[PDB]
Amino acid sequence: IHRIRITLTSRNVKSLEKVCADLIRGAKEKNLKVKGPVRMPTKTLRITTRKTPCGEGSKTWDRFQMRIHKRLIDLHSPSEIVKQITSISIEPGVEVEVTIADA
Amino acid sequence: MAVQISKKRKFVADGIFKAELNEFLTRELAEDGYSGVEVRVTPTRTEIIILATRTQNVLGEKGRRIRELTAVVQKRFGFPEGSVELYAEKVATRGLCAIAQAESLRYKLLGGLAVRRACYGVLRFIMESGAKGCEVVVSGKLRGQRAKSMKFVDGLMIHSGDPVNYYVDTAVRHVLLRQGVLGIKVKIMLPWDPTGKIGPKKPLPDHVSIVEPKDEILPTTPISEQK
Amino acid sequence: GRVRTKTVKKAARVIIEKYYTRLGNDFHTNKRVCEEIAIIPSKKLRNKIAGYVTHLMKRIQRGPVRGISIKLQEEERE
Amino acid sequence: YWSHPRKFGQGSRSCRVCSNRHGLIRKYGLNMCRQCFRQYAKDIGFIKLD
Amino acid sequence: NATIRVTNLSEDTRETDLQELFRPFGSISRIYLAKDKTTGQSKGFAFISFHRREDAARAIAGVSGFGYDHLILNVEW
Amino acid sequence: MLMPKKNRIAIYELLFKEGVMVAKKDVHMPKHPELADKNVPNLHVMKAMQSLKSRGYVKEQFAWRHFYWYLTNEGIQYLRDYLHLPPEIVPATLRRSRP
RNA sequence: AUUGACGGAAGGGCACCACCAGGAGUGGAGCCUGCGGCUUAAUUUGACUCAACACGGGAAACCUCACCCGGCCCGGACACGGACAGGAUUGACAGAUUGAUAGCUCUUUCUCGAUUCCGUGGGUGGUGGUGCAUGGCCGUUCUUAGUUGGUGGAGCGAUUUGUCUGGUUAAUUCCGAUAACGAACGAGACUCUGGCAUGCUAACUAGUUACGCGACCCCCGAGCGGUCGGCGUCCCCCAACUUCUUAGAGGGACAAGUGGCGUUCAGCCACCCGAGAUUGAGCAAUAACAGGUCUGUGAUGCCCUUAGAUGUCCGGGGCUGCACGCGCGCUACACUGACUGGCUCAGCGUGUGCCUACCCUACGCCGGCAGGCGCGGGUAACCCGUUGAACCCCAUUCGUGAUGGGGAUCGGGGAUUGCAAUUAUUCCCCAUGAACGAGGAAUUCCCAGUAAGUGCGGGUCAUAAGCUUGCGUUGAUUAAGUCCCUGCCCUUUGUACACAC
Ligand SMILES: [Mg+2]
Ligand SMILES: [Mg+2]
Ligand SMILES: [Mg+2]
Ligand SMILES: [Mg+2]
Ligand SMILES: [Mg+2]
Ligand SMILES: [Mg+2]
Ligand SMILES: [Mg+2]
Ligand SMILES: [Mg+2]
Ligand SMILES: [Mg+2]
Ligand SMILES: [Mg+2]
Ligand SMILES: [Mg+2]
Ligand SMILES: [Mg+2]
Ligand SMILES: [Mg+2]
Ligand SMILES: [Mg+2]
Ligand SMILES: [Mg+2]
Ligand SMILES: [Mg+2]
Ligand SMILES: [Mg+2]
Ligand SMILES: [Mg+2]
Ligand SMILES: [Mg+2]
Ligand SMILES: [Mg+2]
Ligand SMILES: [Mg+2]
Ligand SMILES: [Mg+2]
Ligand SMILES: [Mg+2]
Ligand SMILES: [Mg+2]
Ligand SMILES: [Mg+2]
C-alpha cells in the first residue's frame, strides 16, 4: 500500500483521454479509491520564425506551436496491482511516469 | 536518476530523434521504396518499424542489412546494446503513398526514361489504385537550358483549409542528373472510407449525405394487435 | 454577409423533398431532425442548413417555391 | 591549432543539421538553423495552428 | 472456407516453421508455400487452410503484427 | 594520413568486431566516443575510413553531421588478412543470425 | 475572324497598403540604426518604386568572417613509378629568428620505425563566380474573386454558350432572366483562438466555504463581532464542495423571432430575448515574374582555385571610419507637466543545456549604487511567484524662464562579463548642460477594447535592446459613405501589337 501517482503526458488530447479512460475503468473494476484525472495547464511551446530563407520579401512570419497536455491519476493500492492496471495497450503519443510515493 | 530533463526539452528531443532517424533512413533506403518510420516503445526493447515497399532488400541478405541498420542506429543514438530491434513491414497500398510514388518516379527518371511517359505512368498507377485525384509536378531543366515546370493533374484536388492535412499527402524529392537537378512534387488525394486504412475516416466537412427514406406505406383504417 | 451558399441551399432542398412530413416551422426541432437524418460533419453547417430549412418551410405554406417537388402537388386538385 | 577559446559566441554554436552558424534557434534545446527548423518542423511536432 | 493469406514472409521460412507457428491454435489441413519456380525459397506468400473456419478466425488477430524473423507479417482472409 | 600504427590497428579491430562504424564530422573532437580507451582522435577515424572507402572496402552514408560506414564483403577478407585473424572469426553483423 | 495585352477611349464595381470626417504622426531637433557617397590596407557583401534601405532573423571587441596585413598546417583519398630496416620519414630541448612557448626557418644533434616522402594521373575542400543554368523555400500579381472539364446548343476551325441584362453579397455569394443543364478548384465550409454555462467530469502540483486553534483591536462583561496569503482538517475522516482556477466532453447562434423595404426571391434595416446578432488569425486556385536566395544545407550543373591555395588555423586590424543626401525609429519641446514621497492593480511566457562551457532565482549579511559573499528551492499549476510592472491615483515643491522642460556632448571615478573592453560592450556615481518653443513642400497608418499612451516576457544573448515578436493595462475623436485622388477587377470599343509600344 502506497500513494502511487501516474502522470500521463501527450501532444494530442484524444489518445491521452482514452488511455486515461482505460486506466480509470480498469482501476474502478478492481475496487480502488481512484482520485481521478487532474488536468494540469497545457504548455504551448511557440517558435516564430521568418518565412523566407533569404532576407527579402514583405517580412512575413511563421508561427509554429506545439501543445503539451498533462494528466494525473492517484491510486491507493499495492504495487503488483498497479502493475496489471497499467500495461494495457498504451497509445504511441502517450508517455507515462509512475511515481511510487517517493522519487 | 541523475539525468532529468524538462518535458519541453524531452518532447523536442524525441521529435528531433524521430526527424533524424527518418532523414537517415530516407537517405539509406531510398531505392528500396522507403515510406516512413514508426518508433514503438516496449518495456523490454525499442522497436523501429520501417515502412517500405520492397522489404526484402531492406531485410537484406539473410538479415545482414537489417542487422547493420540496427548496429548503426544503436551506435549513433546511444541506445543500450540489444535494446533496439528493427522490423520491416510492407506498405499496404503503394498507390496511395506520395513518398513511395515520388521515389518510384525518381528512380524511373534515374534510369533512361523520358519525363512525360514516366509521369503519365505514375499518374495512371495512382489513379488506378483508388485515388480521388493526383498531381505530379516536375520542375527543372527539362527542355534545353531554360527551366520550366510541367504539371500533370487527374481528378479532384483540394488545396485550402484543414482537410488538406488529412485528405492529401505530399512528397518533394530531387533527382540529380547530368545537366542539373530535377524537382518532383507528388500529391495524392486519398479516398474516403469508414473504418478502413485506405484513407481518412471522417468525411469532407462540406459533404452532406442524406439517408434515403424508407418506403412508408400508409394506414387506411386503425387496427391494433393484442400480442 | 448572411448569404447562404450552394451547399446549404442544395442540402436543405434535398432534406425537404425527402422528409417534408417531419419538418415544421421550428428551428430547434428541425435542427434535431436534420441531425438525425443527415450526416453533417460539423455543427455550424447543421445550424445553417436547419435555418434555411425553417425559412423554406415558412414559404411552402404560402405557395410552391420554385425548385422543390413534393407530394403537395397531388392535393392541388383545384 | 584549435587554440582560440570557443566556449561562447556564434563560433561555439552551429546547427545540428548543416553546421551553419547564422539564424540558429536555441530555444527548447533545438540548436537548429531557422531554415532547417522550417523544413523539419512537422517532423519534430510543431504544427502551424495559428 | 478457412482462407489465410500470410504475407511478408522471409526467405528462411519453410513449411515447418509456419506449421509450428499455427500449431498452438490447433491442427492444419493444407499448407501452401508459394515457392519460386526453379529456385528454392518463398515469393512472400502463404496460403493456409486450418481444417476449421473458426480457429483460423481467431488466429488472424493473433499472429497479426508479431515481427517474425525481422519482418512484420500481415495475415488476412 | 599519418597516424600511429596502434591507432589504425585499433580502428580496424573495432570495425571488424562490429561490422559498422559511426563517427561525427568534427575534425577537432579529441577522442572518438567508442575508442576513447585507446585514445584515437576523431580525425584519425574519419581519415582511416576515407582511406578504406576509396579502395572499396566500406560503404559510406552521411546524414546530419554523422558518417555511417558498413563493412563490405571485400573489406571483411581484407581486414581478415590484415589483422592476421584465423578464418573462423566473423563480424557481428554478418553470419551472427539467430533461429 | 478569334484569343490576350494595350488606349494621353466609354461605362460599372471594389479597397483607410484609396479618399472623405478625424486621431496619432513622419518630414523640422538631438541621438540610435540601415543605405548611398567620400575616405581607406580593407573600409566583405546581397537587395533598389510598391514587392530595397532595425531586411539577410545581420544587436560583428575575439569567434562569427566572407575583407586587409602576416605567419603555421594538410585535414593532397586512391592508382602507378622512384627512394627505402645500411632507415621512407615524424617530433624536438637550447641559442639566434619571430607578434608569438609556430622545430616556421638556421646551427646543433637526439628521437620516430614503414603509418609516410618525392614525381605523374586523379581526389577533395571552398560564406569563390553565375539566382540570366537550376531543386526547394519565400515574396509579388492577390488574398483581390478568379479559374476549368462532361454532355448539350453554335461554327471548316481557332474559339465560344455555361462564366449572364438586372437585384443581392465580403465573395463567379446567391436569387432571378435564360441554349443551357449538372459539376470541380478558389470563396464559403474547415482548424486554432475570444466571449457564455452556479448544468456534467473531476482535482494537497488550484482553490472556496464552514469548523477548530492562534495573534490584534474595541467592550460596561460585551459578539454565530472585525482583520489575517497565520496554522490545521492528507495520520484519511478527525469537513464538505467546485462558485472562483485548471481542461475534457457536450450544449449554445441560425438572420432563428417580430415589424418595414425588396420582383413578397436572394437579401437588407430596426428591435425583443440573449453571453454573443460581423472576435481575430491559419490554410489558401489556374497561370505567371529571367522577383530574392548558389552567403541555410553532405540541394546542385558548369566554370575558377587547390600547397607561396579562393581549403583551414592562428595573431592583429575592419565592418563602427566622416564636409554630405535619404529611410525605419527612440527621446523631447513641458503645468492635461517635471521632481519627491505615499497607495494600489496584470497577462502571455522562460528557466540547470548530446557535443555545450553558458539557467531562473527566494532568504540572510556587507556596499550609497552597479555589485559581492553565504545558503536554500526549482527539470517546474510544486520554486522564483499571490510574478507587489509602468502609465494611472493621492499629497509636497516649481511657476511660463530654454526653467527644477530636454539630456546630447564631455571630464573624473567604481563594478560586472570575458582569454582580451583602447576605436569608449554593459551597468553605477558626481560633474558639464547643446539643439529643440510643436516642425515647410510632401507623406504614412488606422474605425472598437481599435488608434494612441504605458510597461512586461520571448528571439538575438559569456556581456547586452532605441529592433522585432507576442502579452496585458488606461482607453478615445471620427465614420457605417464614395469613386474625386491612388490603384485593382469586369463589360463595350480600336489595333499596323502576340518577347504584349
Ligand atoms: Mg473548397
Ligand atoms: Mg477559407
Ligand atoms: Mg485624410
Ligand atoms: Mg513621437
Ligand atoms: Mg526627424
Ligand atoms: Mg501590394
Ligand atoms: Mg556589438
Ligand atoms: Mg581585441
Ligand atoms: Mg572579426
Ligand atoms: Mg615541423
Ligand atoms: Mg626551440
Ligand atoms: Mg558550400
Ligand atoms: Mg529568379
Ligand atoms: Mg527559384
Ligand atoms: Mg461541345
Ligand atoms: Mg534577376
Ligand atoms: Mg538556396
Ligand atoms: Mg581572425
Ligand atoms: Mg553593417
Ligand atoms: Mg522596413
Ligand atoms: Mg529632467
Ligand atoms: Mg536646464
Ligand atoms: Mg532581451
Ligand atoms: Mg535586428
Ligand atoms: Mg497613398
From Swiss-Prot, chain B:
It is a peripheral membrane protein. Its EC number is 4.2.99.18. InterPro entries: KH_dom-like_a/b, KH_dom_type_2, KH_sf_prok-type, Ribosomal_S3_C_sf, Ribosomal_uS3_C, Ribosomal_uS3_CS, Ribosomal_uS3_euk/arc. Changing residue 139 to A: No effect on phosphorylation by PRKCD. Changing residue 70 to D/E/R: Abolishes phosphorylation by PKB. Changing residue 195 to A: No effect on phosphorylation by PRKCD. It catalyses: 2'-deoxyribonucleotide-(2'-deoxyribose 5'-phosphate)-2'-deoxyribonucleotide-DNA = a 3'-end 2'-deoxyribonucleotide-(2,3-dehydro-2,3-deoxyribose 5'-phosphate)-DNA + a 5'-end 5'-phospho-2'-deoxyribonucleoside-DNA + H(+). Methylation by PRMT1 is required for import into the nucleolus and for ribosome assembly. The modification N6-acetyllysine is found at residue 62. Coiled coil: none annotated. The keyword Cell membrane does not apply. This is Small ribosomal subunit protein uS3. It comes from Homo sapiens.
Curated annotation (Swiss-Prot), chain C:
One of its GO terms (biological process) is rRNA processing. The chain holds residues 2 to 79 of 135 of the full protein. This is Small ribosomal subunit protein eS17. Component of the small ribosomal subunit. The ribosome is a large ribonucleoprotein complex responsible for the synthesis of proteins in the cell. Part of the small subunit (SSU) processome, first precursor of the small eukaryotic ribosomal subunit. During the assembly of the SSU processome in the nucleolus, many ribosome biogenesis factors, an RNA chaperone and ribosomal proteins associate with the nascent pre-rRNA and work in concert to generate RNA folding, modifications, rearrangements and cleavage as well as targeted degradation of pre-ribosomal RNA by the RNA exosome. It is linked to Diamond-Blackfan anemia 4: A form of Diamond-Blackfan anemia, a congenital non-regenerative hypoplastic anemia that usually presents early in infancy. Diamond-Blackfan anemia is characterized by a moderate to severe macrocytic anemia, erythroblastopenia, and an increased risk of developing leukemia. 30 to 40% of Diamond-Blackfan anemia patients present with short stature and congenital anomalies, the most frequent being craniofacial (Pierre-Robin syndrome and cleft palate), thumb and urogenital anomalies. The lineage of its organism: Eukaryota, Metazoa, Chordata, Craniata, Vertebrata. The keyword Nuclease does not apply. The gene is RPS17. One of its GO terms (cellular component) is nucleoplasm. The modification N6-succinyllysine is found at residue 18.
From Swiss-Prot, chain D:
The modification Phosphoserine is found at residue 3. One of its GO terms (molecular function) is structural constituent of ribosome. Its cofactor is Zn(2+). Zn(2+) binds at residues 15, 18, 33, 36. Pfam families: Ribosomal_S14. Binds 1 zinc ion per subunit. One of its GO terms (cellular component) is cytosol. It is linked to Diamond-Blackfan anemia 13: A form of Diamond-Blackfan anemia, a congenital non-regenerative hypoplastic anemia that usually presents early in infancy. Diamond-Blackfan anemia is characterized by a moderate to severe macrocytic anemia, erythroblastopenia, and an increased risk of malignancy. 30 to 40% of Diamond-Blackfan anemia patients present with short stature and congenital anomalies, the most frequent being craniofacial (Pierre-Robin syndrome and cleft palate), thumb and urogenital anomalies. Component of the small ribosomal subunit. The ribosome is a large ribonucleoprotein complex responsible for the synthesis of proteins in the cell. This is Small ribosomal subunit protein uS14. It comes from Homo sapiens.
Curated annotation (Swiss-Prot), chain F:
One of its GO terms (cellular component) is membrane. GO terms for molecular function: RNA binding; structural constituent of ribosome. The modification Phosphotyrosine is found at residue 12. Keywords: Cytoplasm, Diamond-Blackfan anemia, Isopeptide bond, Methylation, Nucleus, Phosphoprotein, Ribonucleoprotein, Ribosomal protein, Ubl conjugation. Component of the 40S ribosomal subunit. The ribosome is a large ribonucleoprotein complex responsible for the synthesis of proteins in the cell. Component of the small ribosomal subunit. The methylated form interacts with NPM1. This is Small ribosomal subunit protein eS10. It comes from Homo sapiens (Human). The gene is RPS10. The chain holds residues 1 to 99 of 165 of the full protein.
